Coordinates of C-alpha atoms and ligand atoms in Angstrom, one line a residue:
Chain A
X1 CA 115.3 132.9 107.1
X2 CA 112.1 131.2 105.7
X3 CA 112.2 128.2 103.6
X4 CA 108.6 127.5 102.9
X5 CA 106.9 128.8 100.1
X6 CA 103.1 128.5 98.8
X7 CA 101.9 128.7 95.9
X8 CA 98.7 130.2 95.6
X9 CA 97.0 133.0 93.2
X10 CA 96.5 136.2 94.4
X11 CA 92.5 136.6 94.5
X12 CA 91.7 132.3 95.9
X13 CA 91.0 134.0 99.4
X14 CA 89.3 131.2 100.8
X15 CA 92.6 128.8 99.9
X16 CA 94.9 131.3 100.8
X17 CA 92.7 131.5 104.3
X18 CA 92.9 128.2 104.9
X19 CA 96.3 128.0 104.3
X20 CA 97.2 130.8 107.1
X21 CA 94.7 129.3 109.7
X22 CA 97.1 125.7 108.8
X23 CA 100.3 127.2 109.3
X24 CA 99.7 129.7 112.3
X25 CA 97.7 127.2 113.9
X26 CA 101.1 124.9 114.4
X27 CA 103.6 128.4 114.4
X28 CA 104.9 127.6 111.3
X29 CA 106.6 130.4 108.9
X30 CA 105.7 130.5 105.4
X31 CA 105.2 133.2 102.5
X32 CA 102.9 132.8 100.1
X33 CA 104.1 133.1 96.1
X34 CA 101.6 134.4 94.1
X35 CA 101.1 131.7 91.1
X36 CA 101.3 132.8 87.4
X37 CA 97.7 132.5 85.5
X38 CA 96.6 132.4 82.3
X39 CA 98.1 136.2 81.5
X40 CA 100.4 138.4 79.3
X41 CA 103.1 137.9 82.3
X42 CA 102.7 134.0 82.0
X43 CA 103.1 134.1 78.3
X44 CA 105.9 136.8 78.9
X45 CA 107.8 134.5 81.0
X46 CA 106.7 131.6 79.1
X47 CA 108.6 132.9 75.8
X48 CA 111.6 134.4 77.6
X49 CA 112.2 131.6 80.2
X50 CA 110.4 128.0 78.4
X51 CA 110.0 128.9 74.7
X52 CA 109.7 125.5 74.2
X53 CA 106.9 124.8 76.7
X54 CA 104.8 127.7 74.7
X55 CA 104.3 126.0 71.9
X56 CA 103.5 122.9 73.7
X57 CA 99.2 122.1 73.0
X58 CA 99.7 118.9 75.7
X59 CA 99.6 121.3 78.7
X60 CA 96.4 123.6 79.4
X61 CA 97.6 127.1 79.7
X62 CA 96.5 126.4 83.7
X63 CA 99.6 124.1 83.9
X64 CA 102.0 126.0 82.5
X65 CA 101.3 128.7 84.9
X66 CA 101.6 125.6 87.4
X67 CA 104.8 124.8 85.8
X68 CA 106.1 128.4 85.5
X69 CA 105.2 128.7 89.4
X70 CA 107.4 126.0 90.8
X71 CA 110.5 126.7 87.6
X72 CA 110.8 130.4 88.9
X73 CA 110.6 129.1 92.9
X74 CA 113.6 126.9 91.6
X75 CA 115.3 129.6 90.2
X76 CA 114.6 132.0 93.3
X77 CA 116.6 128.9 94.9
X78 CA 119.8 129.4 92.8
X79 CA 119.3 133.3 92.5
X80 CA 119.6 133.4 96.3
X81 CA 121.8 130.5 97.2
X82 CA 120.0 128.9 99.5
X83 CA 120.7 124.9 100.2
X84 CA 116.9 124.0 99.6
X85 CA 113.5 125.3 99.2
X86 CA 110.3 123.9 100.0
X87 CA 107.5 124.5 97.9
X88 CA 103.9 124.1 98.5
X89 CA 100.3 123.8 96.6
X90 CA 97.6 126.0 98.1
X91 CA 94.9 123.4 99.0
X92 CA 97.5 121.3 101.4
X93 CA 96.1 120.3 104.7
X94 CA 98.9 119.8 107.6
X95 CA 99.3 116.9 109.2
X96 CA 99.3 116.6 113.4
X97 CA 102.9 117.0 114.0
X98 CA 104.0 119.1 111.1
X99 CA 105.5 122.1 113.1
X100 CA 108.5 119.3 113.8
X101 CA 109.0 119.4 110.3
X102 CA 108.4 122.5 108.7
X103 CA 109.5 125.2 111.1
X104 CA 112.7 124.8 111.5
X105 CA 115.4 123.1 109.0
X106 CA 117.6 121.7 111.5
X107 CA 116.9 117.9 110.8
X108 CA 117.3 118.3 107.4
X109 CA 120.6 120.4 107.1
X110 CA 122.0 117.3 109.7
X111 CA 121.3 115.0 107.2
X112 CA 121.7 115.8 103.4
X113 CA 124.3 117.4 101.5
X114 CA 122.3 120.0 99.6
X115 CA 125.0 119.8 96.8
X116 CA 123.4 116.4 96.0
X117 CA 120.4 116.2 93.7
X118 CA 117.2 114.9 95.3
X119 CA 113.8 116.2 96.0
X120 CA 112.2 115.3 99.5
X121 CA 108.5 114.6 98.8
X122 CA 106.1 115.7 102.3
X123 CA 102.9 114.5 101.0
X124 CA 100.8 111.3 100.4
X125 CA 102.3 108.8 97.8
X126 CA 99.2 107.2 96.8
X127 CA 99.0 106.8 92.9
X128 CA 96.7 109.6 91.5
X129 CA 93.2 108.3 90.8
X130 CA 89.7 109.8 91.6
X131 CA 86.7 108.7 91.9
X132 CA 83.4 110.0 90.4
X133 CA 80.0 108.9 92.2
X134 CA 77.2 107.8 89.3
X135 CA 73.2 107.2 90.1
X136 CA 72.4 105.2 86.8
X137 CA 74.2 102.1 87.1
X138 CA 72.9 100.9 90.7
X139 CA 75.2 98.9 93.2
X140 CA 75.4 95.6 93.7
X141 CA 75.7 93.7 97.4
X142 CA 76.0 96.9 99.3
X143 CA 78.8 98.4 96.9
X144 CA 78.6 101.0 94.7
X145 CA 80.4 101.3 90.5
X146 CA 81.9 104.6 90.6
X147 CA 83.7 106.0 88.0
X148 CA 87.6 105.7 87.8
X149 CA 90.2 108.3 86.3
X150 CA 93.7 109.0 86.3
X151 CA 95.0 112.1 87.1
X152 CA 98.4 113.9 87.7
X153 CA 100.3 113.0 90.8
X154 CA 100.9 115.9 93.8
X155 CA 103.6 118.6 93.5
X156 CA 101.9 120.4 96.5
X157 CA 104.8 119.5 99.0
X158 CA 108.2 119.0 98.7
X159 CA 111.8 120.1 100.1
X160 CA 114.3 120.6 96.8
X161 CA 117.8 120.8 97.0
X162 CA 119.8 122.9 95.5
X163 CA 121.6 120.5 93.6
X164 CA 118.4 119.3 92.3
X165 CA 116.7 122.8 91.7
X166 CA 119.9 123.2 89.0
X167 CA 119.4 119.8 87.4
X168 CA 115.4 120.3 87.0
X169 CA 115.9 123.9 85.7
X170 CA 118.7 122.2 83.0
X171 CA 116.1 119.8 82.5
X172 CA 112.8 122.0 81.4
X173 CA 115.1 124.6 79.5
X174 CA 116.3 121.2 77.2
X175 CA 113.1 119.7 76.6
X176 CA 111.7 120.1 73.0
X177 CA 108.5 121.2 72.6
X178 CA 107.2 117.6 72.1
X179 CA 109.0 116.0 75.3
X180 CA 107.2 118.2 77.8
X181 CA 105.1 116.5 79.7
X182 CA 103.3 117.5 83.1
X183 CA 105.1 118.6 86.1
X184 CA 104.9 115.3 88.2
X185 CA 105.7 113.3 85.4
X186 CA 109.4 115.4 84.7
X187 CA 110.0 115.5 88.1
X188 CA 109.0 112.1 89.6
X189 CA 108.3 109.3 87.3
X190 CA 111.0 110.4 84.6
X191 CA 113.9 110.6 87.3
X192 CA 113.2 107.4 88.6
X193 CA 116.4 105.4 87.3
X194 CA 118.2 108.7 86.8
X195 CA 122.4 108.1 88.0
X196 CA 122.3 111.1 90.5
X197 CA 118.8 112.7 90.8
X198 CA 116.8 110.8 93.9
X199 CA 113.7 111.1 94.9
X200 CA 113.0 110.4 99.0
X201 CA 109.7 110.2 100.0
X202 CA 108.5 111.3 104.1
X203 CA 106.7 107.5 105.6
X204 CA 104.4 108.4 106.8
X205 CA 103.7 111.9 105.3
X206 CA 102.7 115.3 106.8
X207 CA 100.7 116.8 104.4
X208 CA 98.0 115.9 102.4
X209 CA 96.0 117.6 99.2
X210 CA 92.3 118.1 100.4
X211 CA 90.7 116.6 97.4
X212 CA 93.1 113.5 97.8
X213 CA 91.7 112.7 101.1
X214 CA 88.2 112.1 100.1
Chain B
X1 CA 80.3 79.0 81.4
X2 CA 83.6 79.8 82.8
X3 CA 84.5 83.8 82.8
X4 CA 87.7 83.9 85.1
X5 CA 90.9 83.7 84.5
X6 CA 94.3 83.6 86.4
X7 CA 97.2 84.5 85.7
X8 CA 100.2 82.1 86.7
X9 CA 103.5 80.9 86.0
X10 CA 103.1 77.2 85.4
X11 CA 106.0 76.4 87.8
X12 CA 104.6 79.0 90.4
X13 CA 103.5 76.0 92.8
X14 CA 103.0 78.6 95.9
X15 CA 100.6 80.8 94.6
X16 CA 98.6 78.5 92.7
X17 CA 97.9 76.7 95.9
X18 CA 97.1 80.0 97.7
X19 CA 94.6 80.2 94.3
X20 CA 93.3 77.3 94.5
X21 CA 92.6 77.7 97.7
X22 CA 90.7 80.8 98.0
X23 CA 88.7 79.9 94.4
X24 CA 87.6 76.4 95.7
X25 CA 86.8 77.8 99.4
X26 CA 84.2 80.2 97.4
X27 CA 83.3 77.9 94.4
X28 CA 84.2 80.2 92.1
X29 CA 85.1 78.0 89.3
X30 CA 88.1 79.6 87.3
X31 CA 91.5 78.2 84.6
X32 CA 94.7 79.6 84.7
X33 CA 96.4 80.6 81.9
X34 CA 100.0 79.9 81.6
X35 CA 101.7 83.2 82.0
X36 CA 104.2 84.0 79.2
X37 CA 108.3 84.0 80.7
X38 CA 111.5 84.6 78.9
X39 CA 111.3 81.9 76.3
X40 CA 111.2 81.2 72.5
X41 CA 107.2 80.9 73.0
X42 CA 107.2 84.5 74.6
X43 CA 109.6 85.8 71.6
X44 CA 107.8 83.9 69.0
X45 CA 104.2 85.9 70.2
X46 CA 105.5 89.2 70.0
X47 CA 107.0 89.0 66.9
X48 CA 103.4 87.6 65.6
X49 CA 101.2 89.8 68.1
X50 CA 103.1 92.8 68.8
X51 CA 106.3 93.4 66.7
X52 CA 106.2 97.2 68.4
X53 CA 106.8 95.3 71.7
X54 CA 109.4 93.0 71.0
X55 CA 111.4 96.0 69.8
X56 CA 111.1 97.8 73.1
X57 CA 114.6 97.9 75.0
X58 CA 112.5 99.6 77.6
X59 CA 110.7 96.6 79.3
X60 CA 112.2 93.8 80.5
X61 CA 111.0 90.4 79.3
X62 CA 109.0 89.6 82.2
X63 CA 107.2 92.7 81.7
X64 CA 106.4 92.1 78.3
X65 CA 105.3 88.2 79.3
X66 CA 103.0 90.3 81.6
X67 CA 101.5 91.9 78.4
X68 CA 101.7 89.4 76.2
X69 CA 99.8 87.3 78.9
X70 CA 96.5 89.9 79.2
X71 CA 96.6 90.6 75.7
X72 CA 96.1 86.8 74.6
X73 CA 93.0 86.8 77.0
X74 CA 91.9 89.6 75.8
X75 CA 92.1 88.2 72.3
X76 CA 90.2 84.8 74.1
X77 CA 87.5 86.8 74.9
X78 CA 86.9 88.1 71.0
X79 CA 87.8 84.8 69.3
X80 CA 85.1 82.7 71.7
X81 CA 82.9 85.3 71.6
X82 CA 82.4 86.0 75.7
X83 CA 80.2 88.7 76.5
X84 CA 83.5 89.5 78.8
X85 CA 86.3 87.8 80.4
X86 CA 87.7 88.2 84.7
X87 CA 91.3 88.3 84.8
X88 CA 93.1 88.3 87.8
X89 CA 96.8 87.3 88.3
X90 CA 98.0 84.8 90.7
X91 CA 98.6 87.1 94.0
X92 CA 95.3 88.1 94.1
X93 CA 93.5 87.5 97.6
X94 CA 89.4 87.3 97.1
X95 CA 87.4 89.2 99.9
X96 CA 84.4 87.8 101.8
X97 CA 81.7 87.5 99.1
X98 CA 83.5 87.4 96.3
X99 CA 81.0 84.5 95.0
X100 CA 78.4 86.9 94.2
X101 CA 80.3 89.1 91.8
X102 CA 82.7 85.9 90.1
X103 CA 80.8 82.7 90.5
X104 CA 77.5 84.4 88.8
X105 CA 76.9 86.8 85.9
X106 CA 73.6 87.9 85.9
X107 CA 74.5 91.3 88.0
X108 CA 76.8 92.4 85.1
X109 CA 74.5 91.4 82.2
X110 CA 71.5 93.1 83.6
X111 CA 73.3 96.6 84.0
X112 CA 75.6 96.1 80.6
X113 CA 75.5 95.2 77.2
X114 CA 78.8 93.7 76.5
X115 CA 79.1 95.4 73.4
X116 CA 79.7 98.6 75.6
X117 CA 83.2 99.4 76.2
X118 CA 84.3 99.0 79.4
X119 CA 86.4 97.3 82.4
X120 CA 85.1 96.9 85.8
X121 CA 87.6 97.1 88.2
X122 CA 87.8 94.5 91.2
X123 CA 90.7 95.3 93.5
X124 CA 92.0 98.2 95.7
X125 CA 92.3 101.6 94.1
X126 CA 94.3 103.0 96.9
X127 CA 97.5 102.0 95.8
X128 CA 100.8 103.0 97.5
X129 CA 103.4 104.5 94.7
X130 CA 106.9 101.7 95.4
X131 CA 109.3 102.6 97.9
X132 CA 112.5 101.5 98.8
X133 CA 113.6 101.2 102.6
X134 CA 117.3 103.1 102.9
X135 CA 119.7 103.2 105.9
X136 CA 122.4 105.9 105.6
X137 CA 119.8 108.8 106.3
X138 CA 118.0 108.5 109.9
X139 CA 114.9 109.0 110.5
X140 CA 113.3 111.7 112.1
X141 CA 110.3 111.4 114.4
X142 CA 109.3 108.4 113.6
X143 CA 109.3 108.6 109.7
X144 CA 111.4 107.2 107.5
X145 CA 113.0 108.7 104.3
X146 CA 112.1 106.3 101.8
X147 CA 113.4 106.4 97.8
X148 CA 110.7 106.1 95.4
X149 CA 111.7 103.3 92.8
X150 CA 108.3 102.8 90.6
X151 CA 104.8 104.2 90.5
X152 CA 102.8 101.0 89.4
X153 CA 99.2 100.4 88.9
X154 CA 97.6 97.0 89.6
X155 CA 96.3 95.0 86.8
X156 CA 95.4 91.8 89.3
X157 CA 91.7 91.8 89.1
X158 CA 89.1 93.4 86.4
X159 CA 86.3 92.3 84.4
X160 CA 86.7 93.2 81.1
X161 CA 83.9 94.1 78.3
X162 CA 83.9 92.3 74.9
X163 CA 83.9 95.5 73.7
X164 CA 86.7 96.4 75.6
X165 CA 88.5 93.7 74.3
X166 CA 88.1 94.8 71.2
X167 CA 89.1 98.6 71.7
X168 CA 92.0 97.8 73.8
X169 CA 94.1 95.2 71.0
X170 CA 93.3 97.7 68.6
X171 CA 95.6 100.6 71.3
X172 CA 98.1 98.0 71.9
X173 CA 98.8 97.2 68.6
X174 CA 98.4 100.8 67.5
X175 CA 101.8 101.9 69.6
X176 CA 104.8 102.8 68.6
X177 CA 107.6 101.1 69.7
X178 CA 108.7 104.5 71.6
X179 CA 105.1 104.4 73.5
X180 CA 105.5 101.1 75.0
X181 CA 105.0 101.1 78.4
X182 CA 104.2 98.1 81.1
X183 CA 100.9 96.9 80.8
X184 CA 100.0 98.4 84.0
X185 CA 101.5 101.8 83.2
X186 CA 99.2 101.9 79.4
X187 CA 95.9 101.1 81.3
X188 CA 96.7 103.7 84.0
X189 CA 97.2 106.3 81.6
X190 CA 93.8 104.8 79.8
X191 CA 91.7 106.0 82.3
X192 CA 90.3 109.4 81.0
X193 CA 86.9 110.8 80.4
X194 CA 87.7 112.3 76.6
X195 CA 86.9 108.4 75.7
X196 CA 84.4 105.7 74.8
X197 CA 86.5 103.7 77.1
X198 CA 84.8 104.1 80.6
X199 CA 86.8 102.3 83.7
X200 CA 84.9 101.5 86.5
X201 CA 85.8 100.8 90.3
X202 CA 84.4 98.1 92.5
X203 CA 83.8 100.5 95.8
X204 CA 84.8 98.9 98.3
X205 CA 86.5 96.7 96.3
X206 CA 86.5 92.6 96.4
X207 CA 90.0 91.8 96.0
X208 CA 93.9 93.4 97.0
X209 CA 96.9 91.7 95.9
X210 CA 98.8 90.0 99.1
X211 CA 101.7 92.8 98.7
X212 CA 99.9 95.2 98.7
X213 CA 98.0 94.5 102.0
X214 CA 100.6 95.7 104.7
Ligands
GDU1 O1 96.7 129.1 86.5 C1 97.0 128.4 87.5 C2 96.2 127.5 88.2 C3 96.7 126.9 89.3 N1 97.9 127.0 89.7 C4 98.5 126.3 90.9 O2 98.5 125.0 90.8 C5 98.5 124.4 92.2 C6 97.7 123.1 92.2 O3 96.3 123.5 92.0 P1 95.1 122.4 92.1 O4 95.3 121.6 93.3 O5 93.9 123.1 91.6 O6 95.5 121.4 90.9 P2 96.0 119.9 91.0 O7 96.4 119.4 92.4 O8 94.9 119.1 90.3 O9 97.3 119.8 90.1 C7 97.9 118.5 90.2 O10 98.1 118.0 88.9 C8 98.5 119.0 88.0 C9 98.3 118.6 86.5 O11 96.9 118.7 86.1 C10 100.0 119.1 88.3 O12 100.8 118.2 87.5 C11 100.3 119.1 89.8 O13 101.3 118.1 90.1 C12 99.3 118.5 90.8 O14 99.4 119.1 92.2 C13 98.0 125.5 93.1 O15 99.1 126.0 94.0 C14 97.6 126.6 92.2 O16 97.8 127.9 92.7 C15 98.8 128.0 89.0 O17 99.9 128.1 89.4 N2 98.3 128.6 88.0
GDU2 O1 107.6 86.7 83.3 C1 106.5 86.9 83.8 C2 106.5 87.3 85.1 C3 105.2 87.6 85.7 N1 104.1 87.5 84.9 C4 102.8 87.7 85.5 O2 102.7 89.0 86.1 C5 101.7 89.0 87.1 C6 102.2 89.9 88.2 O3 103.3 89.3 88.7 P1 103.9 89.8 90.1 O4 102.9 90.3 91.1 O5 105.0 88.8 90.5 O6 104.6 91.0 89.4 P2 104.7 92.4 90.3 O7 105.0 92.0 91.7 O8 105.7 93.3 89.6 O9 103.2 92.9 90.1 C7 102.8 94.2 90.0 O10 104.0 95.1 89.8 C8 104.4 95.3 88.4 C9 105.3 96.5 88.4 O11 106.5 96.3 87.7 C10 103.3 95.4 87.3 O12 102.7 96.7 87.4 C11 102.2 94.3 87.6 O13 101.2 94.4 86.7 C12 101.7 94.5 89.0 O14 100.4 93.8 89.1 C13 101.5 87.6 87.5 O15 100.2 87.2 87.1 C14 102.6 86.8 86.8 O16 102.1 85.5 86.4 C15 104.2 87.1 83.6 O17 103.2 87.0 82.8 N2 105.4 86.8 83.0
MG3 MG1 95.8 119.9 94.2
MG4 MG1 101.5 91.6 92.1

């Protein structure tokens, strides 16, 4: 049964197209989950699900339907009983071999215990930072002063265990109001020195956010 | 008029001779500056400095040497009254002609008025988040399953602004105790647009710390 999950909103046709060329392209199964949006059923599920994240002014309404996206994946997870679930952003690009990695779960299930808690990141684990080109400071010896900002590191590709879909569901319904914090941040850099929660990361990876790889 | 700095262990023989080196082979004329360790001298500064930090069970001491070490340059720069300050720290490797940008000012002050706030920065912006090689899980064709242990940002090589200086004592010492962070970590999360602050990046850049290299 299918593993592989992207989340995309319903009307981005041109994402959602370039996902299906991506996948088919290398045979691999996938169904797309249509994201929440800013929207009466995001704040619906918002007070019923993460009262606390409602209240919360640090996320854009934008993330929390973000947010709310991958929590209900996680909970689909549980719901069904299945030993992982691997989630996806819609503006991934595929690396060259990817089909030996993403359509079929046999060299995971030989590996991990899905009991354990870890996340299995697929995607490039450079440190989040873009660039922005500016014309009214001019270069100097053949190199140019662009613009530098941090943003948010990827959640567009990762396998989650079981184990781990349970501890990060724990997790967000906990957190007050004022110790939410984005996505990445909750499920990457906060776990870091947690006692059973891991996170692996794919060296080299397979998948790549297109804006990242400019 | 001597605007770079390195920061260095004193006892770190190694790579002040790779320093040395690499400085002298450009004549780019430079001091180090004795990096703060564990000591009274390291305890003693906080408590004067940045009582907030020496109250911080989240760092380690070497971490808060780190930031005690950049924040007393940055203080330099004010109390001498520089138009701005280079600070690298002592794994830095320069790149071909590094001379132009560090041995010579003119390029900076004709596109800058130091009372802007800003930092320039110098070395690689493509930075690979820390992993950590394992061997109980196999890998799989011909990519390994790594663990992530930190996401760390590279404060090796930037120019810095008197009035950036200026603006970023005034955010160190402004932080709570719960807020502290490494060095690294704080000026990572500084680079934003909804600022005065404005980071800049050297693209390419000049200079990549030797670790960082493979
Ligand atoms: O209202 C929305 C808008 C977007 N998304 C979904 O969010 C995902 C990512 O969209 P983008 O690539 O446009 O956004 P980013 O890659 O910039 O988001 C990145 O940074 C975010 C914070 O700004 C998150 O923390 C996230 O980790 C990370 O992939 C997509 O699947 C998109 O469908 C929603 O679920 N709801
Ligand atoms: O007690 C100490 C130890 C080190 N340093 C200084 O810290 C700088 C960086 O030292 P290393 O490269 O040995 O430290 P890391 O290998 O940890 O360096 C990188 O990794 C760190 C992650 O923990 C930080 O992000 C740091 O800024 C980053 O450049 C050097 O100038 C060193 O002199 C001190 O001031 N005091
Ligand atoms: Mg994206
Ligand atoms: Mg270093």
């Amino acid at each position: 049964e299918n593993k592989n999950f992207v989340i995309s909103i319903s009307t981005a046709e041109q994402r959602r197209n370039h996902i299906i060329e991506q996948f088919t392209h290398q045979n691999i199964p996938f169904e797309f989950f249509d994201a929440f949006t800013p929207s009466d059923k995001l704040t619906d599920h918002l007070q019923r699900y993460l009262p606390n994240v409602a209240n919360a002014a640090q996320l854009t309404m934008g993330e929390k339907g973000c947010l709310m996206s991958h929590f209900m994946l996680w909970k689909k997870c549980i719901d069904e009983n299945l030993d992982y679930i691997t989630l996806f952003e819609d503006d991934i690009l595929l690396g060259e071999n990817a089909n030996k990695f993403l359509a079929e779960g046999d060299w995971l299930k030989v590996r991990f215990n899905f009991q354990e808690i870890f996340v299995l990141r697929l995607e490039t684990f450079l440190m989040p930072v873009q660039l922005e080109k500016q014309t009214q400071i001019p270069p100097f010896q053949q190199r140019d002063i662009d613009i530098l900002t941090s943003m948010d590191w990827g959640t567009a590709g990762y396998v989650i265990s079981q184990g781990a879909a349970k501890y990060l569901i724990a997790l967000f319904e906990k957190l007050t109001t004022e110790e939410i914090m984005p996505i990445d941040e909750i499920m990457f850099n906060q776990q870091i020195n947690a006692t059973d929660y891991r996170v692996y990361q794919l060296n080299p990876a397979i998948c790549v956010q297109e804006l990242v790889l400019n």
